Design a binder for this molecule. Structure first.
Ligand SMILES: [Cl-]
Ligand SMILES: [Cl-]
Ligand SMILES: [Cl-]
Ligand SMILES: [Cl-]
Ligand SMILES: [Cl-]
Ligand SMILES: [Cl-]
Ligand SMILES: [Cl-]
Ligand SMILES: [Cl-]
Ligand code: NA
Ligand code: NA
Lengths: 444, 444
């Protein structure tokens, strides 16, 4: 009973047992919940998911950038086993406990910037984003929030409002929280089709956004600008150099809280501890979740002390938040990243994947763009000889990969992005094999 | 190493070690997070919380109605230990797993009503409430939601909007989600000061609410009425007999989705599986969290199939939701309730507590009202010979109980309610002792 780090197809995909389990799902779970690949998981670790039929699939999704340090990481297993025996919940607002404080300290340490910082914990990315806005409004005593045109921030009313794409995230769920405005992001590949300078010069892309913010809202009415350092669900869009620094600067000059949403990019994923570290961005607040606790429901807001302390006592909280078992897992996750060279591992994975995809792109112009950092890499698929999105090809490729025992996700505003989010504990051999399969499907 | 089911004071409260840990909390955690009793927990089970100084305190809060079946319940410990080894997270929307489906099935079974039902899982009460609204709007294609004047529903933008009390829940955090309207609830004790018939006749209290809903909103503009079967944070307010049934009926006659928020009342807490069971209320949707998984972050929306299936595919979800470890805990929690007679235990606790508090009230008219069901009981404190709230006395009593090693919570719109939320696994002796201490503090 130890999990073999090799792909294995005993059945077609999905298999007979998964198909049986699926009858139960259809009869019990709301039809609002969509499933990408309906194989039922019995076990996972390293770079492998094992299903109910005995198949072993190559994980190139890590549950959407969550099991970065690998499913059921051994330090996490240990930390959880010990904590679950001591206590499962006290509610930190009732009687506190050291595990919550320890996590706050570690986030204060590892996040960008070097001043006084404070943290608060919740259970989901959407909750943390919600609280970053509460914090910013309490501090500034201003109303509006600016989000970007490829942004994804969550499924609650306000975070739906912050999100750009109507289907499936927003359609039919409003009316939405007021005072949300939308600005254009740095999207080099498609900016390039119109203005070559904007695509390469990030400061100029920031000016484009700032001119609109100033005209349509004004700093005097603005609490916060919120941005993903790399847009996730919107299509793994890495902004031009200079873009994030220029937003930061403008926010400082204008008493607007600058918020980095690092829910997807955070915790070693991009080849640094946080995506903001690549250009030395120091946001006023940074939002984290997903990879923070190796799959346990936990999220955080971390930021400048003066800002984070603005809400009255008892103004922030929630019953479950900073659950002590989830905290034990968070501590073991941070420990794992530092002691096992995960940031460097992310950088190895970049070199391996970029090298394959760039060689593929030279051979096949259906790859409009190859972009990303660390273990967060994507290709955008287009019709040969143009820049027109090819969603059809994107879906066919993913469906073929699934059928070949490869868990690969799509994303993108136009439905034409293949994304790669392997756990860092994937072997180079499994990672290459996953890439081989993608190349074979595209070749014929 | 087994936890002694007896109160013990080795130090004053809080003790020197807790006070040391508190310096760390103040330096790391946002000042927005308030703490009721700053003792740092190292262990808990049965009816006892053990702190960092070796003190053993009587738990009369269960983390705000969360550890109903006891901290670190043995079936939960077992279920969690096994699951954490298999996998920690796949994201149900990526690749599903049986644990999530199993939980959906169990909630479909144990919730009120007998038709076709479906469930969806999230991580917090606030998230589940948010999703009940999304579901209702998708189904009805109407905008407005009605909540009540003692309501508490969560700390996100929309759930803040649904919540009645500005301090500390809402102040400075808006603007809020639009189309939330407020109606008057059945509050027998204080309704009685004005109209004796309204306080006893629930159907008449429903008419009062329905007349306002009709005048200020209209059914043709209304997606949902949402209500707590017993108002929690608002002061443990049990409505008059007939109130909930009459709302249900009106909602059916008018194509408005009726939503029971059972986040606090759910899972054996009130001497039935759900608070709605006492009058046979069958809501269209019921929202659950808190006690569902013995402290693990998990929440649910369960309801009529046709309603729950209204959102398009991928319209509902979230990354962490229905975490497999939290699900293992939920299954063990339901198993624990049924196999160990917890519902009956809740009823024993009612008889014990009501008997003490009613005898206390006959002797001491500072107890304006004694109310509640099962292990959800409260007294409302007032100035002797009137019905004027006495918040001061309420705080003094709780502070004195804390100093005597009793974890007891306050609540209420007017800050004058002592509430009792012991874990069901408290012994009668510890429960009586907790009541003895309260009686002694009030006597002199
Ligand atoms: Cl094979
Ligand atoms: Cl370019
Ligand atoms: Cl609260
Ligand atoms: Cl490199
Ligand atoms: Cl003692
Ligand atoms: Cl009465
Ligand atoms: Cl999502
Ligand atoms: Cl009884
Ligand atoms: Na179905
Ligand atoms: Na402080």
């Amino acid at each position: 009973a130890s999990l073999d780090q090799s792909r294995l197809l005993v059945t077609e995909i999905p298999g007979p047992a998964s198909l049986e389990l699926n009858k139960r799902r259809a009869a019990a779970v709301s039809g609002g919940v969509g499933v990408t690949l309906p194989v039922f998981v019995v076990r996972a670790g390293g770079g492998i998911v094992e299903d109910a039929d005995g198949n072993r699939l190559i994980d190139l999704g890590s549950g959407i950038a969550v099991t970065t340090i690998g499913n059921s990481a051994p330090r996490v297993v240990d930390a959880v086993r010990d904590q679950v025996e001591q206590f499962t919940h006290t509610c930190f607002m009732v009687t506190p406990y050291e595990q919550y404080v320890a996590v706050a300290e570690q986030l204060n340490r590892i996040t960008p910037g070097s001043g006084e910082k404070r943290t608060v914990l919740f259970n989901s990315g959407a909750e943390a984003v919600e609280n970053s806005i509460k914090v910013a409004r309490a501090h500034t005593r201003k109303q509006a929030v600016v989000a970007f045109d490829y942004a994804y921030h969550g499924r609650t009313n306000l975070t739906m409002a912050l999100t750009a794409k109507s289907m499936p995230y927003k359609s039919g769920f409003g009316p939405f929280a007021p005072e949300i405005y939308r600005a254009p992001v740095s999207y080099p590949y498609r900016d390039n089709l119109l203005d070559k300078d904007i695509a390469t010069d990030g400061e100029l892309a920031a000016e484009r956004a700032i001119n609109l913010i100033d005209k349509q809202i004004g700093a005097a009415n603005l609490a916060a600008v919120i941005i993903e350092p790399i847009a996730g669900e919107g299509g793994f869009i890495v902004p031009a150099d200079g873009f994030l620094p220029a937003l930061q600067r403008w926010c400082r000059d204008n008493d607007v809280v600058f918020i980095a949403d690092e829910v997807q990019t955070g915790f070693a994923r991009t080849g640094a501890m946080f995506a903001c570290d690549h250009e030395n961005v120091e946001p006023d607040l940074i939002v984290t979740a997903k990879g923070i606790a190796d799959g346990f429901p936990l999220s955080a807001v971390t930021g400048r002390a003066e800002i984070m302390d603005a809400p009255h006592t008892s103004g922030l909280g929630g019953t479950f938040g900073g659950n002590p078992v989830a905290c034990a897992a968070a501590l073991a996750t941070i420990e794992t990243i530092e002691r096992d060279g995960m940031v460097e591992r992310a950088r190895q994975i970049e070199r391996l994947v970029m090298d394959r995809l760039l060689r593929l792109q030279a051979a096949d112009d259906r790859l409009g763009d190859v972009r990303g950092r660390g273990a967060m890499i994507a290709m955008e698929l287009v019709k040969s000889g143009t820049a027109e999105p090819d969603a059809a090809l994107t879906q066919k490729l993913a469906a073929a990969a699934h059928a070949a025992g490869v868990i690969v996700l799509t994303c993108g505003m136009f439905g034409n992005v293949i994304r790669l989010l392997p756990p860092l504990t994937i072997s180079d051999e499994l990672l290459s094999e996953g890439l081989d399969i993608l190349c074979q499907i595209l070749a014929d």
